[PDB]
């Protein structure tokens, strides 16, 4: 077992699309440029993290194929590739492999440097291959060889017989170049070094002299913390959904739910409703949120009135029985209750308000039974002509249709986080990590940043503070009740200074507006982005890779604040010189008279006109599409 | 659980039984089969995974029947306290509701 450098090997066509004379970038599992590739000389099994790059160089027919899977045993499915002098066989079976195969004691069937790439993603096992006569430092792309639809789970693999190279692919962004033939002839790994990042940003393989803003460094979070109120009681949702009888819609029953842990996923067990109907929130995320208070409104209506339980609805139920606000945030759960609320002859216990003087405001209840005066003649509390009882009975019967069958409706109203939360999900809290860039979750408020002890004088009723951008910059811990400032993690723009690829590949990195001691020095790619790593301090920021000199020259590459950079074998930084030193010999009675002259011809270039461009909207926006043209005609 | 067969969904079926990708392109066809898959006393042939260590990736299948370790004490392949069988039976009955 040895280790070696992969150079710019490991490149395949990322699609079946013909492309020519183009610079195309993409994101895929690619073998990194100059990657730590393990060179095995021939026996434990090797892993399959995000794909494999395999290379062979042997003149004899020694390496016969490969074995893939997870445990290489008849409990699971394993994938076997064999080659001989006339045919290649691919097979998928629960083989009982030997620990040093060369194969087994006991589905899918398929019929000079040698490079192969194995990917296992999207239920497909893709094999790319290439043969290149003489790892070489040259560049060559791997054409796709086969695509197996097996969709097998793969975590370990081994070769089948003698030296071979093995590398592991990583999710990378690559900039490939397609020539006139349509063949990938060159590639750039966008995260290899600052020069490659500049090339990717400029979408070119050659960089002119200058300074370019490529990206911004950002310190990644180290931990994930969760802060929830210390609540152990379980919300009594069974008392609402599993009630023996429900109230009428005119007198809908409201249940207060607070100081408990709500597990909405169990609600499906309580009632046989088909699906949720939530507004301003998803039923999927209900377990991840906190609420100040929860209100469960229970009633029974007709099926055709179920659509009336929604924001912005009118009708008898909405106007006079139960009204939801336009900005309602919550869920509506309605299920058929024909077997429980309908009897032979008519169930007349359930009633709804039919007449009222004015429409109800949201979340208003009216249990008055006074006689409604339809006309102008007073009723004097006696029902009769133009004076009807305000409540009408449903009279549910089992023989009625689905639109007339009774439906039990429970409306869950959620109060968003403004006061201390009392209803929370089953999410478990963690410790309150301070002074570190972490991911935090305060009562459902999710963010990333550094939490520090706050000096802000929060009033007792206040729970969080917001900045100019209406984002939470201070928060009160639900358990310790202390105020914490939230500051975004260390970040800053990065500029790359290069003398031009035609001159040298050396580059300098300027972290803009960043103190030189604040430059990240993380040794792990997961703790800082970009993954590449590379000292003078200027008012423009921290410059790394350029040697400051005391001499002064004309500004070549403007860094800023009077600092410029130049290429002199290495990149140097200096203070730009304003001009040559001079001193006029002034005197009370001294003059300078010219005795010669020079006829000087200078050149001044002035632009006069630019290119005249005509644009046709129909072709650009639509391009011979009648439907698109008709839709575009509506834009005026 | 029919609503769980959709992109971006979580829940028992989506997390541990059948997961669709966010960029899923296709169709989902679900129809009631009460007359064919429900029997008096309970049809216990149909099961779903209730416990798993991690959420499934899209288009992944898990047929393992190993005991799930809910707590920190190893189960040693024996079901008991904080160690339950990962598969739970539906027990469909004709008297059940549409949900």
């Amino acid at each position: 077992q040895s280790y070696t450098n992969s150079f710019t090997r490991g490149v395949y066509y990322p699609d079946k699309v013909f492309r020519s004379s183009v610079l195309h970038s993409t994101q895929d599992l690619f073998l990194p440029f100059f990657s730590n590739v393990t060179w095995f000389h021939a026996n434990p099994v090797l892993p399959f993290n995000d794909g494999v790059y395999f290379a062979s160089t042997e003149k004899s027919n020694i390496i016969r194929g490969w074995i893939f899977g997870t445990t290489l045993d008849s409990k699971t499915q394993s994938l076997l590739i064999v080659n001989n002098a006339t045919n290649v066989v691919i097979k998928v079976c629960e083989f009982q492999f030997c620990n040093d195969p060369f194969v087994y004691s006991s589905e899918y069937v398929s019929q000079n440097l040698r490079e192969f790439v194995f990917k296992n993603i999207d239920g497909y096992f893709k094999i790319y291959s290439k043969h290149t006569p003489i790892l070489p430092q040259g560049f060559s792309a791997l054409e796709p060889l086969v695509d197996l639809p097996i969709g097998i789970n793969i975590t370990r693999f081994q070769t089948l017989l003698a030296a071979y190279y093995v590398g592991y692919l990583q999710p990378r962004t690559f900039l490939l170049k397609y020539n006139e033939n349509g063949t990938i002839t060159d590639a750039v790994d966008c995260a290899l070094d600052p020069l490659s990042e500049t090339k990717c940003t400029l979408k070119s393989f050659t960089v002119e002299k200058g300074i370019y803003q490529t990206s911004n460094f950002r310190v990644q979070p180290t931990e994930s913390i969760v802060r929830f109120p210390n609540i152990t009681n379980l919300c009594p949702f069974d008392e609402v959904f599993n009630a023996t009888t429900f109230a009428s819609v005119y007198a809908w029953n409201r249940k207060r739910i607070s100081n408990c842990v709500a597990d909405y996923s169990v609600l499906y067990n309580f009632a046989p409703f088909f699906a949720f109907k939530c507004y301003g929130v998803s039923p999927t995320k209900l377990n991840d949120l906190c609420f100040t208070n929860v209100y469960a409104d229970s009633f029974v209506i007709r099926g055709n009135e179920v659509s009336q339980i929604a924001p912005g609805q009118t009708g008898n139920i909405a106007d006079y029985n139960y009204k939801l606000p336009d900005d309602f945030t919550g869920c509506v759960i309605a299920w058929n209750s024909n077997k429980l609320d309908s009897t032979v002859g008519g169930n007349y216990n359930y009633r709804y308000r039919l007449f009222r003087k004015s429409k109800l405001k949201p979340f208003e209840r009216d249990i008055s039974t006074e006689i409604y005066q339809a006309g102008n003649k007073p009723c004097n509390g006696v029902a009769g002509v133009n004076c009807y009882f305000p409540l009408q009975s449903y009279g549910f019967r089992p023989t009625y249709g689905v639109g007339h069958q009774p439906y039990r409706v429970v409306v869950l109203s959620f109060e968003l986080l403004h006061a201390p939360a009392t209803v929370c999900g089953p999410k478990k809290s963690t410790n309150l990590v301070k002074n570190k860039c972490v991911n935090f979750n305060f009562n459902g408020l999710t963010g990333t940043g550094v939490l520090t002890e706050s000096n802000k004088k929060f009033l007792p009723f206040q729970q969080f503070g917001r900045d100019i951008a209406d984002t939470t910059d201070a928060v009160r811990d639900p358990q310790t009740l202390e105020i914490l400032d939230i500051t975004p993690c260390s970040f800053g723009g990065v500029s790359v200074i290069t003398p031009g690829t035609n001159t040298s590949n050396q580059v300098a990195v300027l972290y803009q507006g960043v103190n030189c001691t604040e430059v990240p020095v993380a040794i792990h790619a997961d703790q800082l982005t970009p993954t590449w790593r590379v000292v003078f301090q200027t008012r423009a920021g921290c410059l790394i890779g350029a040697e400051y000199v005391n001499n002064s020259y004309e500004c070549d590459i403007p860094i800023g604040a009077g600092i410029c950079a130049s290429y002199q074998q290495s990149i140097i930084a200096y203070t730009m010189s304003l001009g040559a030193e001079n001193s006029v010999a002034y005197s009370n009675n001294s003059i300078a008279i010219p005795t010669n002259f020079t006829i000087s011809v200078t050149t001044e270039i002035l632009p006069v006109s630019m290119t005249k461009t005509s644009v046709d909207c129909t072709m650009y926006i639509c391009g011979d599409s009648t439907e698109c043209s008709n839709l575009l005609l509506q834009y005026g | 659980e029919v609503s769980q067969i959709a992109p971006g969904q979580t829940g028992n079926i989506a997390d541990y039984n059948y997961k669709l990708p966010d960029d899923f392109t296709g169709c989902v066809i679900a129809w009631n089969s009460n007359k064919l898959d429900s029997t008096v006393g309970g049809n216990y042939n149909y099961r779903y995974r209730l416990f798993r260590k991690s959420k499934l990736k899209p288009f992944e299948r898990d047929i393992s029947t190993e005991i799930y370790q809910a707590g920190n004490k190893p189960c040693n392949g024996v079901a008991g306290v904080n160690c339950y069988f990962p598969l739970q039976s539906y027990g469909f009955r004709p008297t059940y509701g549409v949900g």
Epitope: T222, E223, I225, N230, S429, T430, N431, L432, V433, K434, N435, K436, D477, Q479, T480, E482, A522, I523, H524, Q527 | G71, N72
Partner: antibody, heavy 123, light 103 residues
Framework: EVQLLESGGGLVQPGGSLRLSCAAS????????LSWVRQTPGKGLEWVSS????????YYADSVKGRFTISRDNSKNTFYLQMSSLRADDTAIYYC??????????????????WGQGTLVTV | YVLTQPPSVSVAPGTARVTCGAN??????VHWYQQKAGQAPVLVIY???GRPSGIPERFSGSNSGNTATLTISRVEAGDEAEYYC???????????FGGGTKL
């Protein structure tokens, strides 16, 4: 104020057994994960064991794993360290330590804000 | 996980520096305790710069790169004690204490 009191420390023969008890007051006992930390005279501190608030999880150092056993009684606001097969190196001053609120879980941010008086145990 | 501390440190009265070294210690929360002669340890620093109430403002903390630093400005006669750095190893669930520094 928060108060921690150790007891049970004394003289024990090598290879014997002993039990330390720490009584706690001034805080919600059921919500804090308590610790036992020992120090040999003339040496540095060394964490011994830890128990969670619900007593559903126990943690032991590799140097005392199997020999020691931590337990707690929330109804009595006490927690105990029962050690057996004590070696000669186990002679030390033992402290029962409590974490502050917000770091009371045995997790990344676990640390101690209050320490007990401690008891000397000689093997 | 192993925490490395100097055996001792000396400084003139009235700028003391104590260092706790470990691999990738910048991603770990480091807490500093002070223990006098025959007294229980007292937390002086938490979360690499957090100072509890009642502790003199002389004590300050930092944690970066591969080292955590506890700085005592204008060290008095009563500040001579043993200082310990402590972390919680994520990979093993062990409470790891420092070697110990006396000044």
């Amino acid at each position: 104020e928060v108060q921690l009191l150790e007891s049970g420390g004394g003289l024990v023969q090598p290879g014997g057994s002993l039990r330390l008890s720490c009584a706690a007051s001034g805080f919600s006992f059921s919500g804090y994960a308590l610790s036992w930390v020992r120090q040999t005279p003339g040496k540095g501190l060394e964490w011994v064991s830890s128990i969670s608030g619900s007593a559903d999880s126990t943690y032991y150092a590799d140097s005392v794993k199997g020999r020691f056993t931590i337990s707690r009684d929330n109804s009595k606001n006490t927690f105990y360290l029962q050690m057996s097969s004590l070696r000669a190196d186990d002679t030390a001053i033992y402290y029962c330590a409590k974490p502050p609120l917000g770091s009371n879980l045995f997790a990344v941010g676990y640390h101690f804000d209050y320490w007990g008086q401690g008891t000397l145990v000689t093997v | 996980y192993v925490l490395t501390q100097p055996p001792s440190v000396s400084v003139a009265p009235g700028t003391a520096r104590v260092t706790c070294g470990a691999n990738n210690i910048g991603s770990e929360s480091v807490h500093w305790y002070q223990q006098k002669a025959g007294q229980a340890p007292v937390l002086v620093i938490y979360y690499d710069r957090g100072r509890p109430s009642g502790i003199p403002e002389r004590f300050s903390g930092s944690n970066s790169g591969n080292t955590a630093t506890l700085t005592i400005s204008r060290v008095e006669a009563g500040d001579e004690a043993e200082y310990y750095c402590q972390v919680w190893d994520k990979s093993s669930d062990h409470v790891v204490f420092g070697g110990g520094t006396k000044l």
